[PDB]
Amino acid sequence: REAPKVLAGTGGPLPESFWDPAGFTNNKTDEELLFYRAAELKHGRIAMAAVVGWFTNASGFHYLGDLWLKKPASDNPIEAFNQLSLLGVFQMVFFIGCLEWLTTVPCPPPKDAPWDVIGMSDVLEEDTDENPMAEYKKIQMQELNNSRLAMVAIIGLIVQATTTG
Amino acid sequence: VLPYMENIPRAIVEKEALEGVLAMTPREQWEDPPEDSVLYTLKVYAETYGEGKATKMPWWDWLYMRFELPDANEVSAEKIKLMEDDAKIQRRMMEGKIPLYVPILGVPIYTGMTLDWKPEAELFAGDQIRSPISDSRFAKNFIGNTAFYREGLENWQRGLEIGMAHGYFLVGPFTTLGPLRNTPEAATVGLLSACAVIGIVSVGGLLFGATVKPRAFDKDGATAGSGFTEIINWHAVGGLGGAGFCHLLLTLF
Amino acid sequence: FENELGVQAPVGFWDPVGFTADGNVASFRRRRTVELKHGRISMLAAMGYMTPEITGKFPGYLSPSTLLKYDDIPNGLGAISKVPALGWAQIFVYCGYAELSQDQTPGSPGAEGNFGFKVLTSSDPDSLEKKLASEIANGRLAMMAFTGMATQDGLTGSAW
Amino acid sequence: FESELGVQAPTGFWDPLGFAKDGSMKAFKRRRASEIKHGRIAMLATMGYITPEITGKFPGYLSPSTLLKYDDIPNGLGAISKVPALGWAQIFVYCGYAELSQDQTPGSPGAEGNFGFKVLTSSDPDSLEKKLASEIANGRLAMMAFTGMATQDGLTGSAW
Amino acid sequence: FAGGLTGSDYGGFGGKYEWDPVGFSTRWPEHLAWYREAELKHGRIAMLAFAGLLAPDLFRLPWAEFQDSSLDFANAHDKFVAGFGPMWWGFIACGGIEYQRFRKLGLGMEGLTLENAGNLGWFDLPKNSEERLFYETAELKNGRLAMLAVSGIFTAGIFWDQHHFPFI
Ligand code: CLA
Ligand code: KC1
Numbered sequence: 001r002e003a004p005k006v007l008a009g010t011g012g013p014l015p016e017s018f019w020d021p022a023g024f025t026n027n028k029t030d031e032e033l034l035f036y037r038a039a040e041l042k043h044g045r046i047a048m049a050a051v052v053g054w055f056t057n058a059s060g061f062h063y064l065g066d067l068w069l070k071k072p073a074s075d076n077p078i079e080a081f082n083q084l085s086l087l088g089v090f091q092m093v094f095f096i097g098c099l100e101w102l103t104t105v106p107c108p109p110p111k112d113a114p115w116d117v118i119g120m121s122d123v124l125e126e127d128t129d130e131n132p133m134a135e136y137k138k139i140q141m142q143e144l145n146n147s148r149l150a151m152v153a154i155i156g157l158i159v160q161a162t163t164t165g
Numbered sequence: 166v167l168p169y170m171e172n173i174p175r176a177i178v179e180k181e182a183l184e185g186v187l188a189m190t191p192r193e194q195w196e197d198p199p200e201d202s203v204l205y206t207l208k209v210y211a212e213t214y215g216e217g218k219a220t221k222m223p224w225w226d227w228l229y230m231r232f233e234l235p236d237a238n239e240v241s242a243e244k245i246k247l248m249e250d251d252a253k254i255q256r257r258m259m260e261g262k263i264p265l266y267v268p269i270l271g272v273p274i275y276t277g278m279t280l281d282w283k284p285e286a287e288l289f290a291g292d293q294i295r296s297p298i299s300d301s302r303f304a305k306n307f308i309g310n311t312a313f314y315r316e317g318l319e320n321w322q323r324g325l326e327i328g329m330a331h332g333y334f335l336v337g338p339f340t341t342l343g344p345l346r347n348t349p350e351a352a353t354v355g356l357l358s359a360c361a362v363i364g365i366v367s368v369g370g371l372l373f374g375a376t377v378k379p380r381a382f383d384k385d386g387a388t389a390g391s392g393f394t395e396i397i398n399w400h401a402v403g404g405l406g407g408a409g410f411c412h413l414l415l416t417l418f
Numbered sequence: 419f420e421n422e423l424g425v426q427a428p429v430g431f432w433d434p435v436g437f438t439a440d441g442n443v444a445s446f447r448r449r450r451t452v453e454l455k456h457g458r459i460s461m462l463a464a465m466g467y468m469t470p471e472i473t474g475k476f477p478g479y480l481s482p483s484t485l486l487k488y489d490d491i492p493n494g495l496g497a498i499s500k501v502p503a504l505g506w507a508q509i510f511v512y513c514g515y516a517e518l519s520q521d522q523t524p525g526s527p528g529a530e531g532n533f534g535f536k537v538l539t540s541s542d543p544d545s546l547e548k549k550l551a552s553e554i555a556n557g558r559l560a561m562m563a564f565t566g567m568a569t570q571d572g573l574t575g576s577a578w
Numbered sequence: 579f580e581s582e583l584g585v586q587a588p589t590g591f592w593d594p595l596g597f598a599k600d601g602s603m604k605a606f607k608r609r610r611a612s613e614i615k616h617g618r619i620a621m622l623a624t625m626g627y628i629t630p631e632i633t634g635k636f637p638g639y640l641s642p643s644t645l646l647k648y649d650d651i652p653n654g655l656g657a658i659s660k661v662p663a664l665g666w667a668q669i670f671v672y673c674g675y676a677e678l679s680q681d682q683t684p685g686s687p688g689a690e691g692n693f694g695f696k697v698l699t700s701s702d703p704d705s706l707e708k709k710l711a712s713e714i715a716n717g718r719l720a721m722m723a724f725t726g727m728a729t730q731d732g733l734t735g736s737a738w
Numbered sequence: 739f740a741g742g743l744t745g746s747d748y749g750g751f752g753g754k755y756e757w758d759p760v761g762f763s764t765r766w767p768e769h770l771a772w773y774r775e776a777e778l779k780h781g782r783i784a785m786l787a788f789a790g791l792l793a794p795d796l797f798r799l800p801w802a803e804f805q806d807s808s809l810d811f812a813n814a815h816d817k818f819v820a821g822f823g824p825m826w827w828g829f830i831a832c833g834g835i836e837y838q839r840f841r842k843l844g845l846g847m848e849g850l851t852l853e854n855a856g857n858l859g860w861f862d863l864p865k866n867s868e869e870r871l872f873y874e875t876a877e878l879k880n881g882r883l884a885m886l887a888v889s890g891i892f893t894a895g896i897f898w899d900q901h902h903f904p905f906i
């Protein structure tokens with residue numbers, strides 16, 4: 001079984017390593033597979049950011065919350081989050097909701113690339129053979145691979161904590 | 166090739182070194198290289214040395230020649246010609262599409278993406294250049310969906326929305342960080358100051374509409390600057406409304 | 419489904435109740451898969467029940483943090499508890515990698531049993547089929563044998 | 579859609595909150611699949627409550643290692659914490675395999691509730707509608723009876 | 739095109755691993771057979787050295803030895819080399835084996851082409867092509883890996899004593 005051509009060699013152990021061992025790709029229209037890639041990339045970007053936030057919270061770089069709590073916040077990111085007031089947590093929820101609204105109602109993502117919330121596909125050309133420094137597919141694969149790795153890494157951090165301390 | 170670049174002994178220059186020198190030198194440059202070029206010194210040593218010419222040279226002159234001539238690898242390696250060809254193709258392409266670097270830690274770090282810096286409509290326009298901050302779909306649909314540009318909005322709606330935003334913002338820096346900070350009426354004084362700032366900037370906008378008459382928002386017919394003046398008046402109204410709402414949310418909760 | 423593996427000297431049609439439709443090509447391919455897998459796992463299990471008692475258990479620690487010298491762990495069954503959950507998790511992750519590295523979805527070359535472990539890498543000779551048949555026969559024998567050994571040490575202490 | 583198996587007789591096309599206006603088909607198809615599956619599970623669970631009440635708790639030991647005579651597990655809510663987490667995992671795995679079997683993907687034969695039981699395949703005697711509609715109506719009734727039963731089990735405190 | 743020798747092959751990430759940063763193959767292609775012979779001999783000796791780090795910890799061999807502290811392998815060399823003993827005999831045996839290597843190659847390494855480098859008589863190559871390739875690449879990989887490993891042991895189980903299979 002080969003890639004559904006809308007993903008088209010965009011992941012796996014190698015770039016052309018269509019890996020689905022569950023039939024989550026078959027008999028699915030291109031819009032649904034684009035949705036799957038958009039969800040994967042959003043989950044990734046969120047993870048990749050969350051891992052950095054975790055490691056900068058677990059390394060003592062926990063200002064803005066050092067001041068809010070008016071005392072040194074916990075290095076454990078879960079306990080640090082629990083220390084935050086509900087006002088701050090709901091401000092974070094509201095800001096993420098506003099961001100999600102931005103990329104749906106006023107700034108909808110491109111139809112053929114829903115993961116391109118910034119709409120970067122309107123200013124970049126493509127990877128072409130005339131370009132000696134063409135790396136756009138390479139950086140897309142870097143983003144995807146670090147996304148897939150951080151998606152399991154952040155879960156490792158979260159479930160490792162709150163169950164082992 | 167040229168007669169003097171034939172059967173050159175390896176001592177003067179390597180065969181690979183000679184090939185690299187020729188590759189990195191323009192074809193029309195031959196037969197008369199400039200005094201500061203590598204090919205000129207290579208030519209000068211190509212004669213007077215080799216075949217029937219002088220086959221020996223003093224040690225000091227040998228050191229001079231070795232200092233003044235390339236040594237193939239790491240100086241005229243095929244990778245260096247590949248990099249020079251890549252650089253010239255890059256500079257050819259940037260007249261067109263430009264690779265995107267970002268200055269990270271003060272040094273430009275290549276990202277991997279190449280921009281469309283060339284303007285879409287007017288090639289020589291200085292403000293039609295394309296950047297992701299100003300030409301990506303997010304920018305187009307973000308600035309385009311703001312009250313100042315959103316489609317379907319009457320001028321009063323744009324004014325009201327911008328005013329509400331400005332008024333709700335302006336109450337902030339006055340209630341705290343002000344003369345009457347640690348007072349029960351800090352919120353009220355901040356509200357009064359925010360309303361004053363909204364009124365002053367609205368008078369300034371009225372002044373702009375009376376003098377410049379921007380005409381960018383006027384409907385058909387009407388008068389020059391009518392749309393902008395309506396926008397500024399409803400900005401004043403919205404500023405009062407947003408400032409009052411911020412003061413309400415401060416007094417409550 | 420005639421000339422594959424199971425055919426041998428004493429039997430080769432042994433199926434009192436299987437072949438439910440006598441067809442279901444996909445079912446038989448899946449069944450040959452489970453055959454090769456269960457066979458390999460049973461052989462490794464029988465060796466791991468066979469190498470300890472004769473040529474006695476390894477010398478070492480197996481967990482220098484928790485001091486669990488290879489020998490003191492009980493031979494059969496009971497080892498499921500004393501070996502640390504860290505080591506068991508590492509065993510499980512090795513198994514998960516070994517299964518999910520090559521695609522197990524039916525149709526693939528790894529589906530039918532070839533996992534790319536070509537140690538002898540028989541270059542498609544006549545030896546190929548006889549090696550396959552020996553593997554599957556010892557697999558069936560090992561499945562029977564390990565069920566017997568698991569029953570035995572479930573009813574009488576250690577492996578014997 | 580106004581003629582499917584759901585419309586019995588006592589109520590016609592009963593869609594009070596208008597989930598059918600501009601019938602999205604695929605939406606209705608998957609909602610019918612959900613209705614069939616929920617009804618089947620509700621029938622099974624209503625059995626799983628009313629049969630252990632009259633018929634005694636299983637003669638057996640449930641977990642051979644942790645002393646569950648089925649009598650310390652009460653019938654109703656609270657048995658979620660009484661049945662072993664491993665037993666819950668295993669019943670979860672059974673249901674997961676039963677679904678991760680033949681696909682019920684949109685358009686597949688599993689997407690209309692058909693899976694391959696065929697316990698009552700009346701020989702097309704104008705009765706395929708009888709059994710289908712009876713299953714659907716009993717599914718609705720069993721889901722409502724289950725909701726009432728769970729409310730009685732929790733509200734009152736135990737069982738009924 | 740490549741080094742000509744087997745090398746590489748059966749590499750991770752698919753394809754082949756032509757790894758040669760300094761380019762000893764391209765810069766000195768005449769000594770490529772010498773490099774292959776050195777690599778194979780070093781790998782075989784390193785694998786035997788790993789076996790000689792492990793097995794003496796277990797069995798301790800017949801004859802006098804049999805002691806206990808004479809297995810530290812940071813010490814064992816000096817005893818059997820002192821008194822013109824077993825280490826000297828092993829040196830003579832290795833010299834004889836490589837004299838046989840000289841004779842097969844033809845003295846002065848006047849042979850050593852890119853098929854007999856390491857061939858060293860003894861065991862017989864499998865005539866099947868894919869077997870041969872997999873088995874040769876297995877020897878080469880095990881060789882290099884044991885070279886790196888045995889080096890790691892002879893550094894680590896020297897700075898921190900250890901001197902037993904855990905080495906940590
Ligand atoms: C989740 C279960 C479920 C689902 C998916 C459906 C689905 C369907 N039913 Mg159906 N039905 C159900 C339960 C369900 N039913 C029950 C319990 C009864 C008995 C009251 C009925 C009685 C019934 C009749 C009489 C008819 C249908 C029909 C239909 C079809 C069209 C209506 C529609 O779009 O519903 C969409 C699905 C829903 C609206 C389900 C949402 C239920 C909400 C979320 C909860 C309702 C309140 C609930 C009790 C709250 C409990 C507390 C909870 C919050 C914890 C559709 C296939 C019609 C049909 O077959 O036409 C061809 C028809 O005539 N149903
Ligand atoms: C931390 C030090 C380090 C170790 C310890 C290590 C180990 C191995 N490397 Mg590796 N390596 C780097 C460093 C290290 N590598 C770096 C910095 C780079 C970027 C230049 C790099 C690249 C490649 C490539 C391209 C290949 C490769 C190989 C193997 C291999 C063979 C396994 C097998 O084939 O038997 C082993 C054991 C091949 C392979 O893919 O292995 C998966 C191969 O083709 N490596």
Ligand SMILES: CC1=C(/C=C/C(C)=C/C=C/C(C)=C/C=C/C=C(C)/C=C/C=C(C)/C=C/C2=C(C)CCCC2(C)C)C(C)(C)CCC1
Pocket residue numbers: 325329330331333334402403405406407408409410
């Ligand atoms: C943070 C952040 C950000 C953002 C920022 C901003 C921009 C903010 C703002 C905010 C705001 C700025 C908000 C606002 C709001 C407002 C409001 C909320 C208002 C309201 C009002 C009202 C409601 C009014 C009413 C009225 C009227 C209309 C008139 C009459 C009177 C009354 C009162 C009735 C970004 C993304 C950059 C990035 C980083 C992060």
